[PDB]
Write a protein that binds this DNA or RNA. Structure first.
Ligand SMILES: [Mg+2]
Ligand SMILES: [Zn+2]
Lengths: 53, 104, 263, 85, 8, 158, 94, 38, 83, 1111
RNA sequence: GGGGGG
DNA sequence: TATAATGGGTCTGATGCAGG
DNA sequence: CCTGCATCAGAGCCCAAAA
């Protein structure tokens, strides 16, 4: 309670809707979210895969 | 010349006719005894080209010296039989019909 | 409409779809000239639409048109273009090809990294045109047509013909493929080493990229024909020139199984 | 009704040959030979003519007929092209 | 929607 | 390097870890019929005990190998990365561990046997459910993955 | 591995340019019967038959070796393409 | 794969699709469905 | 605008790419109405025509590179360096 | 040799007849051996009693009979005939108007007969009908996914015998009925049944929360007749709701015992679930002029009470094996029979309304064409009628016991999810948990468990022993899954003293949940471990030691084992390998006691006590569906005394009556120089020398000579322009001589065909007009050997037109069949497997001098890499090797039953007894411990393998008890630096052999429309380079290689023709042209009225047809 | 939307 | 060409629609 | 305006594939 939240900051725990995030925080924020949230999965399975792709 | 682009567009009934080498007037396919195509049917050589390379149907003109001739007796052009892969026919509908892609 | 082996006829479904249309058009022309009542012309006209509909996209609207005494929908123009079996994904973005073969793969520890074991009997077919030309230069046969006649019967093959093939394949590479081709290393280039026997010998180090084992896997062989294709294979596609994963950048051809165990 | 159109009178003969054989098979408890039908059809008919009539009566089969499995194989795929060199 | 039923 | 049946070494520590697991399990049963814990709570505590007992027996398997039989084939293949991983080796010399019901919930009863000891038909059957569920998962995934890949090629090909 | 493959990737800005130079050079050699080669008789790639040593028939092998020598020049807009063709067919018949 | 600057002309999108897809097989909203959801 | 790969793939300028992907009739009807011209920019378009793809040895960057030996090269420069 | 059997489990009943699921099902359907008056109403009989009487004249069914087969089984297989019986039916025509009665027996065609072993012969080929699992008819209640506190009642009948019904209770509170995808209020149907508000209130009412919610006043404002018309208007938008018309539709959907059939099992499940009794198999009746309800109200009653915790009401598990039943051969065939019968009935009514209503008999009224076609359709084209798997005897035994969840009435693709593929707790003892396909079909195709049998209702039952007090009776009860859930069932391996349970705590199951229980609580006990698994799984010794995923492969691959000329039974068996051979009906047994009169290669004649001289002919070198040789060999000698059931001949892949799927070889487990890599296998050339893993294979070749419009094809020895070298081995008529060796390219049958108007080209006329040979009337069409095929010609069959007994399909003069045999020695690329799922390709064959060998000089046979074991977790193969080591020196074979087997100490005792023979021989013969044996013992003692400080004999024995021996490398003579596991293993040669799979093509056949190469080895096909393969070439940037694939190596016609010409001329291949399949695409889009235009850079059209398509 | 191999 | 006969026998996600 | 709600178009590769 009484915390400062940027626009596009998750209040709930859960997956963010990329679209809500695109309107709130803009493209670079969405690109950041997608690449990391994908990599999260591959890493958990021991798959080294370069972010560039 | 070299192919740089591919365009796709709607076909007018005029153009569809610009393509066609003949109107298919009969549901016949090939003759049950001779097995040759039935005239004015779906396989007619008079429309779509000769079955044998540089040879007309009845066999008056059988070789390439007449490439481009249309036989008076049987009516078939003497060219490569490969054209049966190329030349289009057409059906003249009595009343117009909608193209289902543009409906459904 | 083609005669198959038995003298029987085989025909494309489009012919039946056209026949339905043609009948209905012709009947409509006849019904008009004879001044049928409006109820009859209306039924005919609506039937004509359905016939056009089945021809262009069958099943799209209404009951799919079927051949009599079969539940199989006739294959319309839309079906030909589209789907896994459609014209695009079957004959356009991929094709069956000439100069190709397949066999069971077997490990070939003795191979160098850029090599594969290739059954000589496979290589003779895959390179058959090359072999014919070379068979004329050393005279094993008077001309190209006669040389081909000698390979037709298997007992007519003399031993000089195998030496002829060795000359042909010199320095050339072949492509090995193991499906599923998940990444670009499902195909790699190898200089073939002719072997007696019916099996392809695969180098141990490339098994990981192919995900090949020897529990009965088979691989396909392809022959790049032109100087351009052959160059592409030897420089870009040769197994020894692709040692690192394009995905992680880590080494792909690396010790495994027995190799690690021994060291 | 036929992809290969047949003269109307000829279609009538074929149906007669069929009709006849069904009679012959119902008394005989088995398929008749060409000869049993040729006799049953009366004068003018030998076994050779019954066979030739049946060859003529054969309808073509679809190139798109599945080769069993029904998943990924068509009959037309097994037919070589004998025309083009 | 059923061409037979409509004609009937 | 070879593999004989004696090469899967049941650690002496196993019997101890099992003795510990059964006395612990009895205390959780008393708290159900004595009304200390719920039905959910009883099941949750049992799974936790057996997970940790499994881990214990694994370290014991690998410690007994490193210290007393460091060239054992299983150990050597596993450690070098030639073949095998800790969990597979644990099933050879240890216990097989907890198995899953056809649904998704885990059985309370584990498989105490190892492949060296051999299972009981009931243990074997209990284990079968999970094997099959994995097989169906894998089968249904390759289609989803395959489809996924084709979309990616189509969106990036240019 | 192709002999001196690392040095060949050194000579070009893009590996695909190497392949093109090699492939075109190999086509030049086959068409003219090798008589335009920049190699000297002891540098010629050789092939071991049952009879004995003969010239390597594989022109792609030849071309990569030639490239290593330095005697080949590669680039864009060096000469109208047709003009090149006649002068080479003049120097080395077919 | 060459541990060096990419050559002009390399078909990079395809390599991206192959690099991402190939591991898909071995992946167990904690697995592959999450990747597809993204 | 953010679209998933499927929607994005279907939206590309190239109608040959889109129609070979999925939703072929829809793709093809909208293209034919629009009178769309495929510029053959990407790979699928060129594969379908059997053309030399715009990648690898087909990239325009490396495609026209010429090779000539110093012996043949000089044997051309001298005739042209005159009137 | 001695056979030592382990295990303490006393198995009360033996396995049932293994094909009984097939034999008993069809015998039950046909009742051919039952006198008609005594036939029960089931199968064919029930079908007739369903289709008849036929109303308007009345055609009534009297009885049917089955004749004898026109041709015996062998004859049918020989002539490409179906093995079948003539069906006749006695029918009486009754005239409803007159009184007239004409009666006759009409011929309905033939019905196929099942052979003794449970298979069929359809057009000459042996076939099997696979049983089908499906949802049992009945009434089910499942929880509604939408409302976490509500339920849906579903009424499901037999497939195609009615609609599915759903009774959801909608959010508004009224109970809705869903039928044929349409929903309406259920109350409306209730009023049609003649129900009044009192009955629904009085019956139900207790749930004032639900009973009042079904009540809708507008519906009650009308008598049962008006409500019946009202519903029909809801159901058929456009049909005038005429009272006879509406009644007819509703009757046919609900009350008609012809269009709506609950099962017989459905009726029982309904009676049991709702606690009512059904007068028949329909949901309602038309009785005394109105409709009287049977099912609907009890189903509503069960649903409402379970919507509020009333005791005794539960949801149904739809995957429970009490609610899923099997449709066996008899039932499947009868459904198709019932369809064909109903179709014939359409014909009866249409003919009973035309051609004079008087001058008609039953023989003229009936056309059997619809019935014959329905039966022929089922047997020829059904998804459940499959080409028999007869690779080896076990193949067919397993095939007949397979269970499919697919087919007409079962899962589709997309359709089947997870619940169905899962192994349900009720699968225990009924459906095998191991034997299933890997991949897309996992869980859909399964195998009947060994002790399981399908009852008359179609539920799989499994045997259990009764337990009274603590005493186990010998009385066995076969239970369905539903009845089993009532009791507490002990494990089969629970200790016994005598007939008494000897343990104070036993391992048992209650509703599948494992539970520890005292002997006072024990109601039943498992018969055996064998009852949990399929027949293939039961053939895996030491199965308790194998991970299931590998055991699966072990099971399935035995199906693929090829019959070997030297085939032997495994040295470690499970004790089932005898029963499988006997039930398979491959071998040959004595009917009664007797004496052997004669023994031949071709036959065995036995003189019994009866005095009758019975001659049993032997099937010799017959070609099975998969081309493996089915061959029987005589095992007795003239004058041998035989008892009832004693062996006479061994079938294929059997040795002295035991299943022999492979050979017993001496194996060393150790890496070998990377020839062992990733499951590859190294073998000793000694195996070929002694003809181990050699198998005979026969391939069948066929050719027709037919009449053409150009003249007759003739099979002749005269073939134009061919040398005598090519024709040397052909007989007078143009057929290859029996016994000739034929190789690829050789002529098998000479044939000529008349040339088309291609009647030799003018180019060809002049050439021939030079060598003075006139161009011949006929061309050479002779049948030749395919690439890679060939062998010895063992048989020829010729069938002409105009020869006694033969008539071919119309137009065909003559058919020739040539049978070619091959002895296949094991070779590099052939695939081997053991019973535990270890499978691999032969990568290297070393000469005997390279094989690792024992100190005493014995070389090993197979070297298997140990890296295959740990990740796979199949250890049964390890114990199999150890027990196999003991057996090599003790000269014995073992029976170790599954889960009651040889355990480690027992194997150790046996291993000690072996060491004495492996060593004591040496110590006597005047040899001591070897120098190298000391070096290994030194290294072994560093490993903790041997006890330090013991004599070498003591230490070698310590290693031998661990199943390890000293092994010398034959390439050096030096020992392997460590002790290696060596022993006897059972390994099979599977049906996948390089000889069959190797294929290559330069150019060949092309497809009609696309002009791309055809597919497959038999067509001389090209390989498919598919989308993912193109991606590979794209990522490499190999543009010219890819373009070759897309043009010159496929459908670019100018290019592929030009390229071949270039290669044979030594030129480089030309730059490609337009692929023909693109032109096809263009023309097909024009056929869709779309204009596709190729443009240049200036946007002008480019003609890719080169003027051919423009006028 | 499909028996076998990878 | 002439009794009269008159109405049929699976599962998912995306997208564009009639409806509280 | 918004939300149910339906209608449609998707659902891995290559090889035997026993018609
Ligand atoms: Mg494999
Ligand atoms: Zn003419």
């Amino acid at each position: 309670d009484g915390d400062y939240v940027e626009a596009g900051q998750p209040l709930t725990r859960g997956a963010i809707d990329p679209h809500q995030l695109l309107e709130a925080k803009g493209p670079e924020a969405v690109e950041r979210y997608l690449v990391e949230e994908i990599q999260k999965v591959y890493r958990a399975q021991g798959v080294k895969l370069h972010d560039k792709h | 010349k070299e192919v740089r682009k591919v365009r796709i567009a709607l076909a007018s009934p005029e153009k569809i006719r610009s393509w066609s080498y003949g109107e298919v007037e009969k549901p016949e396919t090939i003759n049950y005894r001779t097995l040759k195509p039935e005239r004015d049917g779906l396989f007619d050589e008079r429309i779509f080209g000769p079955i044998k390379d540089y040879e007309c149907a009845c066999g008056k003109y059988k070789r390439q010296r007449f490439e481009g001739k249309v036989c008076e007796r049987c009516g078939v052009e003497v060219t490569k039989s490969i054209v049966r892969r190329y030349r289009m026919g057409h059906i003249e509908l009595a009343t117009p019909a909608a193209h289902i892609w543009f409906v459904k | 409409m083609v005669q198959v082996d038995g003298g029987r006829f085989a025909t494309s479904d489009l012919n039946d779809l056209y026949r339905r249309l043609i009948n209905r058009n012709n009947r409509l022309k006849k019904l008009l000239a004879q001044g049928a009542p409006e109820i009859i012309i209306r039924n005919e006209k609506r039937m004509l639409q359905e016939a056009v509909d089945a021809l262009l996209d069958n099943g799209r609207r209404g009951a799919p048109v079927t051949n009599p005494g079969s539940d199989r929908p006739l294959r319309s123009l839309t079906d030909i273009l589209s789907g896994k079996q459609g014209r695009f994904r079957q004959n356009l973005l991929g094709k069956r090809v000439d100069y190709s073969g397949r066999s069971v793969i077997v490990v070939g520890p003795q191979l160098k990294l850029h090599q594969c074991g290739l059954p000589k009997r496979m290589a003779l077919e895959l390179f058959k045109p090359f072999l014919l030309k070379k068979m004329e230069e050393k005279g094993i046969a008077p001309n190209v047509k006669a040389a081909r006649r000698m390979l037709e019967r298997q007992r007519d093959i003399k031993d000089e013909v195998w030496d002829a093939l060795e000359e042909v394949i010199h320095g050339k590479v072949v492509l090995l493929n193991r499906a599923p081709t998940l990444h670009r290393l499902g195909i790699q280039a190898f200089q073939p080493v002719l072997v007696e026997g019916q099996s392809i010998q695969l180098h141990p180090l490339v098994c990981e990229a192919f995900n090949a084992d020897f529990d009965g896997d088979q691989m396909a062989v392809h022959v790049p024909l032109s100087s351009f294709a052959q160059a592409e294979a030897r420089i870009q596609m040769l197994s020894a020139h692709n040692l690192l994963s394009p995905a992680s950048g880590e080494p792909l051809a690396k010790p495994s199984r027995d190799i690690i165990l021994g060291l | 009704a036929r992809t290969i159109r047949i003269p109307v009178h000829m279609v009538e003969t074929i149906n007669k040959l069929s009709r006849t054989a069904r009679q012959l098979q119902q008394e005989l408890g088995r398929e008749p030979t060409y000869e049993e039908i040729a006799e049953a059809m009366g004068p003018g008919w030998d076994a050779k003519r019954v066979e030739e009539t049946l060859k003529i009566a054969q309808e073509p089969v679809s190139l798109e007929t599945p080769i069993g499995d029904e998943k990924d194989s068509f009959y037309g795929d097994f037919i070589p092209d004998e025309h083009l060199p | 929607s059923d061409p037979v039923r409509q004609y009937l | 390097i070879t593999i004989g049946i004696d090469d899967a070494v049941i650690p002496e520590e196993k019997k101890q870890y099992l003795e510990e697991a059964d006395r612990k399990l009895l205390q959780i049963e008393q708290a159900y019929e004595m009304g200390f814990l719920t039905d959910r709570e009883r099941y949750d505590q049992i799974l936790q005990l057996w997970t940790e007992t499994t881990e214990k027996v694994t370290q014991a398997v690998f410690k007994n190998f490193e210290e007393n039989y460091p060239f054992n084939p299983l150990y050597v293949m596993a450690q070098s990365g030639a073949r095998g991983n800790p969990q597979q080796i644990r099933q050879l010399c240890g216990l097989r561990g907890l198995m899953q019901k056809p649904s998704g919930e885990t059985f309370e009863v584990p498989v105490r046997s190892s492949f060296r000891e051999g299972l009981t038909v009931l243990e074997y059957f209990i284990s079968s459910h999970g094997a099959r569920k994995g097989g169906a998962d894998t089968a249904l995934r390759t289609a989803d993955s395959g489809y996924l890949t084709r979309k990616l090629v189509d969106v990036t090909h240019e | 591995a192709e002999p001196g493959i690392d040095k060949l990737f050194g000579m070009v800005d893009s590996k695909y340019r190497l392949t093109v130079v090699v492939a075109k050079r190999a086509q030049q050699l086959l068409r003219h019967g090798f008589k335009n080669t920049v190699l000297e008789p002891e540098e010629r790639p050789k092939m071991q038959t049952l009879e004995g040593l003969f010239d390597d028939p594989n022109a792609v092998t030849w071309a990569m070796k030639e490239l290593l020598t330095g005697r080949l020049v590669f680039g864009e807009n060096l000469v109208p393409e047709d003009r090149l063709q006649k002068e080479m067919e003049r120097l080395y018949p077919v | 794969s060459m541990a060096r600057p990419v050559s002009i002309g390399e078909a990079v999108g395809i390599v991206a699709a192959q690099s991402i897809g190939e591991p898909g097989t071995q992946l167990t909203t904690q697995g592959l469905p999450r990747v597809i959801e993204l | 605008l953010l679209m998933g790969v499927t929607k994005s793939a279907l939206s590309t300028k190239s109608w040959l790419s889109a129609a070979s992907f999925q939703n072929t009739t829809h793709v093809l009807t909208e293209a034919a109405i629009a009178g769309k011209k495929d510029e053959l920019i990407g790979l699928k378009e060129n594969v379908i025509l059997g053309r030399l793809i715009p990648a690898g040895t087909g990239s325009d960057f490396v495609r026209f590179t010429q090779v000539v030996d110093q012996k043949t090269l000089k044997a051309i420069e001298e005739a042209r360096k005159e009137a | 040799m001695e056979i030592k059997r382990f295990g303490r489990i006393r198995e009360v009943i033996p396995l049932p007849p293994l094909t009984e699921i097939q034999v008993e099902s069809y015998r039950r359907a046909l009742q051919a051996d039952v006198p008609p008056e005594k036939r029960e109403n089931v199968g064919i009989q029930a079908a007739f009693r369903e289709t008849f009487p036929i109303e308007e004249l009345v055609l009534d069914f009297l009885e049917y009979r089955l004749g004898e087969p026109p041709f015996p089984q062998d004859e049918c297989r020989e002539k490409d005939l179906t093995y079948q019986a003539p069906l006749y039916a006695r029918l009486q025509l009754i005239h409803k108007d007159t009184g007239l009665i004409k009666e006759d027996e009409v011929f309905l065609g033939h019905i196929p007969l099942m052979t003794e072993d449970g298979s069929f012969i359809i057009n000459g080929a042996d076939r099997v009908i696979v049983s089908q699992i499906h949802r049992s008819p009945g009434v089910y209640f499942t929880p509604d996914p939408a409302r976490p506190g509500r339920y849906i009642a579903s009424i499901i009948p037999l497939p195609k015998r009615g609609p599915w019904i759903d009774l959801e209770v909608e959010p508004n509170g009224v109970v809705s009925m869903k039928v044929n995808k349409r929903k309406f209020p259920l109350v409306l149907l209730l009023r049609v049944l003649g129900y009044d508000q009192e009955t629904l209130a009085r019956e139900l009412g207790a749930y004032g929360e639900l009973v009042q919610g079904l009540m809708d006043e507008s519906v009650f404002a009308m008598r049962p007749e008006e409500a019946l018309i009202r519903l029909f208007t809801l159901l058929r938008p456009g049909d005038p709701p005429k009272r006879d018309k509406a009644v007819a539709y509703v009757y046919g959907l609900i009350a008609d015992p012809r269009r709506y059939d609950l099962g017989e099992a459905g009726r029982y499940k309904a009676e049991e679930k709702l606690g009512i009794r059904l007068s028949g198999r329909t949901l309602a009746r038309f009785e005394d002029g109105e409709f009287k309800d049977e099912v609907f109200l009890p189903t509503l009653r069960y649903l409402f009470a379970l919507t509020a915790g009333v005791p005794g009401h539960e949801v149904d598990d739809i995957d429970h094996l009490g609610n899923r039943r099997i449709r066996t051969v008899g039932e499947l065939m009868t459904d198709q029979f019932r369809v064909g019968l109903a179709r014939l009935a359409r014909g009866v009514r249409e003919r009973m309304l035309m051609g004079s209503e008087d001058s008609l008999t039953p023989a003229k009224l009936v056309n059997s064409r619809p019935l014959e076609a329905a039966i022929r359709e089922f047997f020829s084209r059904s998804q459940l009628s499959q080409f028999k798997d007869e690779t080896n005897p076990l193949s067919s035994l397993r095939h007949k016991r397979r269970i499919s969840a697919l087919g007409p009435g079962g899962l589709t693709r997309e359709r089947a999810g997870f619940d169905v593929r899962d192994v349900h707790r009720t699968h225990y003892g009924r459906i095998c948990p191991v034997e299933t396909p890997e991949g897309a079909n996992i869980g859909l195709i399964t195998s009947l468990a060994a002790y399981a049998r399908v009852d008359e209702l179609g539920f799989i039952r499994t045997p259990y022993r009764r337990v009274v007090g603590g005493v186990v009776t010998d009385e066995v009860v076969y239970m369905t899954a539903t009845e089993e859930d009532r009791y507490t069932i002990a494990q089969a391996n629970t200790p016994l003293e005598g007939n008494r349970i000897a343990a104070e705590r036993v391992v048992a199951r209650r509703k599948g949940e494992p539970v520890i229980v005292s002997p006072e609580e024990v109601e039943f006990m498992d018969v055996s471990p064998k009852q949990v698994f399929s027949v293939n799984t039961n053939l895996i010794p030491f199965l308790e030691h194998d991970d299931a995923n590998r055991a699966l492969m072990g099971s399935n691959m035995q199906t693929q084992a090829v019959p070997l000329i030297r085939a032997q039974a495994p040295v470690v068996m499970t004790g089932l390998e005898e029963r499988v051979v006997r039930d398979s009906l491959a071998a040959l047994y004595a009917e009664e006691d007797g004496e052997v009169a004669k023994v031949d290669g071709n036959r065995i004649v036995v003189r019994y006590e009866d005095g009758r001289l019975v001659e049993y002919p032997l099937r010799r070198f017959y070609r099975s569906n998969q081309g493996t040789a089915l061959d029987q060999r005589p095992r007795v000698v003239v004058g041998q005394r035989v008892r009832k059931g004693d062996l006479l001949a061994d079938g294929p892949a059997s040795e002295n009556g035991f299943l022999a799927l492979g050979q017993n070889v001496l194996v060393a487990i150790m890496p070998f120089d990377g020839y062992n890599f990733e499951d590859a296998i190294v073998i000793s050339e000694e195996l070929l020398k002694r003809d181990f893993y050699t198998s005979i294979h026969i391939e069948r070749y066929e050719i027709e000579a037919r009449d053409t419009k150009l003249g007759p094809e003739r099979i002749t020895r005269d073939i134009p322009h061919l040398s005598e070298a090519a024709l040397r081995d052909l007989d007078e008529e143009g057929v290859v001589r029996i016994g000739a060796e034929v190789k690829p390219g050789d002529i098998l049958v000479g044939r000529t065909s008349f040339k088309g108007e291609s009647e030799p080209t003018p180019e060809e006329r002049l050439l021939r007009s030079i060598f003075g040979e006139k161009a011949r009337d006929v061309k050479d069409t002779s049948l030749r050997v395919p690439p890679g095929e060939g062998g010895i010609v063992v048989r020829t069959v010729r069938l002409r037109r105009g020869d006694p007994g033969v008539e071919l399909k119309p137009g065909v003069r003559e058919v020739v069949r040539v049978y070619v045999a091959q002895k296949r020695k094991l070779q590099v690329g052939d695939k081997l497997a053991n019973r535990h799922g270890n499978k691999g390709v032969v990568a290297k064959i070393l000469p005997v001098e390279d094989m690792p060998h024992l100190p005493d000089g014995t070389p090993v046979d197979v070297i298997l890499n140990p890296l295959g074991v740990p990740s796979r977790m199949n250890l049964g193969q390890i114990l199999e090797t150890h027990l196999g080591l003991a057996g090599y020196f003790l000269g014995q074979r073992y029976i170790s039953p599954i889960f009651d087997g040889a355990k480690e100490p027992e194997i150790k005792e046996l291993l000690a007894q072996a060491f004495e023979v492996y060593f004591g021989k040496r110590k006597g013969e005047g040899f001591g411990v070897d120098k190298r044996e000391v070096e290994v013992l030194r290294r072994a003692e560093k490993l903790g393998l041997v006890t330090p400080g013991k004599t070498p004999e003591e230490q070698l024995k310590e290693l031998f008890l661990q199943g390890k021996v000293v092994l010398y490398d034959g390439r050096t003579g030096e020992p392997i630096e460590g002790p290696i596991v060596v022993g006897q293993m059972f390994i099979m040669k599977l049906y996948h052999m390089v000889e069959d799979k190797m294929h290559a093509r330069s150019t060949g056949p092309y497809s009609l429309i696309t002009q791309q190469p055809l597919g497959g080895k038999a067509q001389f096909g090209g390989q498919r380079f598919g989308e993912m393969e193109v991606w590979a070439l794209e990522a490499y940037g190999a543009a010219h290689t890819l373009q070759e694939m897309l043009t010159l190596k496929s459908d670019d016609i100018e290019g592929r023709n030009a390229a071949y010409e270039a290669i044979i001329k030594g030129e480089d291949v030309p730059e490609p042209s337009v692929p023909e399949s693109f032109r096809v695409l263009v023309k097909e889009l024009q056929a869709l009225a779309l204009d596709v235009q190729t443009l240049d850079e200036k946007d002008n059209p480019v003609d890719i047809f080169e003027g051919l398509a423009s006028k």
